[PDB]
């Protein structure tokens, strides 16, 4: 027994383990993007997604 990390793709990932059927897991964004009417460090959000 252990713990394993997996960099899920931005568009999807397959997961096979044991003899049972696999599962597909995809991802989206979760950084704090939109401001709240006051000055904000929005860039950090766009740095988390599409850093380049």
């Amino acid at each position: 027994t252990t713990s394993r990390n997996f960099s899920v793709g931005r568009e999807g990932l397959e997961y096979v383990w044991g003899n049972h059927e696999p599962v597909r897991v995809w991802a989206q964004e979760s950084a704090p993007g939109d401001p709240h009417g006051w000055p904000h460090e929005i860039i950090i959000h766009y740095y988390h997604r599409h850093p380049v």
């Binding site: 899920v8 568009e11 897991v25 995809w26 991802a27 989206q28 993007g33 997604r49």
Partner: protein, 438 residues
């Protein structure tokens, strides 16, 4: 009528569209790609498997001479040996001091269990793609299955629907493939007629039960050096077994786009890449005249709350004033957002809700209810749960992630130095002339 549309190639993602004709209300049109089917044409090259070294008992010519003779059996090897002295449980088999000679030969044949353990080589080319479509219009559903080639239509209710061709060709299969026991492997098997011991394709037969075999596996006989009778043969390890040991991972765990590959047709299925252009023809009877179509007056949006979620989580409400009880279609003509239901009931002054999925935080677009459009906008926040397996990106991002506030800041940032330089030059020339007056 005929309408063209481009649909992403992906299962379980309905695509909504309309068709506009004067005097006819819009006809909601849903297209769903039930399952893809990429089937390439293949040619059987040969079959191989673990072999078995037949060793018929040596010929013995006693107290005289003998000569070797070749045969047509696979990997046939023959060799004579003089000065041999066969001995057996009964004692000396025959008698002359070194004048006798024994001939030993060996050959190779497929093992009986091969009948289930065989591995077949194949050459594949000219991948072709078959699409199953389900089309819904006017609460009437039709099913169809068509080649992606855009010259052959699908047959369903004597209706013709052309599809394709693919925008970008994709085929996980390589030129040379090898299939064994229901598993596909990507491998460059040696060409037929060319063997190499200790590697795949050491034994090759045109068919599993072919009397003619061709194979070389480096069988070399050894001179008997024991009292009794015994033919010692030295041979290289079977190639098929060594390929089995280090065959690597199969093609299931390597094919991109998650293609589910099945063997008996040797085809990939249910996997997504590229786009498909499709033209749909609709019988005229399907359309309904606008005279009987409900008419909406004074339509207005309201975004109760929106979430920039991968799944379908955004909400919307519409308030309308109409005059006739009936049903009309609904749609969102901006690609960034996709609605959920296409047709809805209408009342004199009722209001109705809708669920929609977006892909940009600034959810601002034109939604067409029944016969009339309506612009409306709102802001959506990113979701807390940032991993899900459900359908995602019903529309791809189109650099629309920029918010309205970001655009406002960018506009307020850029300065009009061009006007400053122009004014500076104008005042410069004016002052230059004034001084030139002196």
């Amino acid at each position: 009528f005929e309408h063209a549309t481009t649909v992403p190639n992906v299962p379980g993602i309905p695509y909504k569209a309309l068709v506009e004709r004067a005097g006819y209300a819009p006809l909601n049109l849903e297209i769903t790609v039930v399952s893809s089917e990429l089937t390439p044409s293949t040619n059987k090259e040969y079959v191989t498997c673990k072999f078995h070294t037949v060793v018929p008992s040596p010929q013995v010519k006693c107290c005289g001479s003998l000569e070797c003779k070749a045969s047509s059996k696979a990997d046939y090897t023959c060799r004579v040996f003089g000065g041999v002295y066969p001995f057996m449980w009964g004692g000396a088999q025959c008698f002359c001091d070194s004048e006798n000679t024994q001939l030993s030969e060996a050959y190779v044949e497929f093992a009986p269990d091969c009948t289930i353990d065989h591995a077949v080589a194949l050459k594949v080319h000219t991948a072709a793609l078959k699409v199953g479509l389900r089309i819904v219009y006017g609460n009437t559903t039709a099913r169809l299955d068509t080649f992606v080639n855009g010259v052959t239509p699908g047959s369903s209710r004597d209706l013709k629907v052309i599809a394709g061709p693919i925008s970008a060709a994709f085929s996980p299969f390589d030129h040379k493939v090898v299939i064994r026991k229901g598993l596909v492997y990507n491998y460059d098997f040696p060409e037929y007629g060319a063997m190499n011991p200790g590697a795949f394709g050491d034994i090759q037969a045109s068919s599993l039960d072919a009397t003619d075999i061709v194979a070389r596996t480096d069988i070399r006989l050894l001179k008997p050096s024991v009292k009794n009778i015994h033919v010692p043969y030295t041979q290289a390890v079977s190639g098929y077994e060594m390929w089995k040991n280090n065959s690597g991972r199969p093609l299931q765990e390597t094919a991109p786009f998650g293609c589910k590959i099945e063997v008996e047709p040797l085809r990939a299925t249910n996997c997504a890449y590229g786009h498909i252009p499709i033209s749909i023809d609709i019988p005229d009877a399907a359309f309904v005249r606008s005279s009987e179509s409900p008419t909406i007056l004074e339509v207005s949006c309201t975004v109760a709350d929106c979430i920039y979620s991968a799944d379908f989580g955004g909400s919307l409400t519409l308030q309308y004033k109409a005059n006739r009880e009936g049903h009309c279609p609904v749609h969102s003509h901006s690609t960034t957002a996709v609605l959920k239901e296409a047709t809805t009931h209408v009342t004199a002054t009722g209001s109705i809700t809708l669920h929609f999925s977006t892909s940009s935080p600034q959810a601002n677009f034109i939604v067409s209810l029944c016969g009339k459009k309506t612009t409306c906008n709102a802001e959506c926040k990113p979701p807390a749960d940032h991993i899900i397996g459900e359908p995602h990106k019903v529309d791809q991002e189109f650099q629309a992630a920029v918010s309205k506030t970001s655009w406002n800041w960018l506009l307020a940032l850029f300065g009009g130095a061009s006007s400053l330089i122009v004014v500076g030059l104008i005042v410069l020339v004016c002052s230059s002339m004034l001084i030139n007056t002196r």
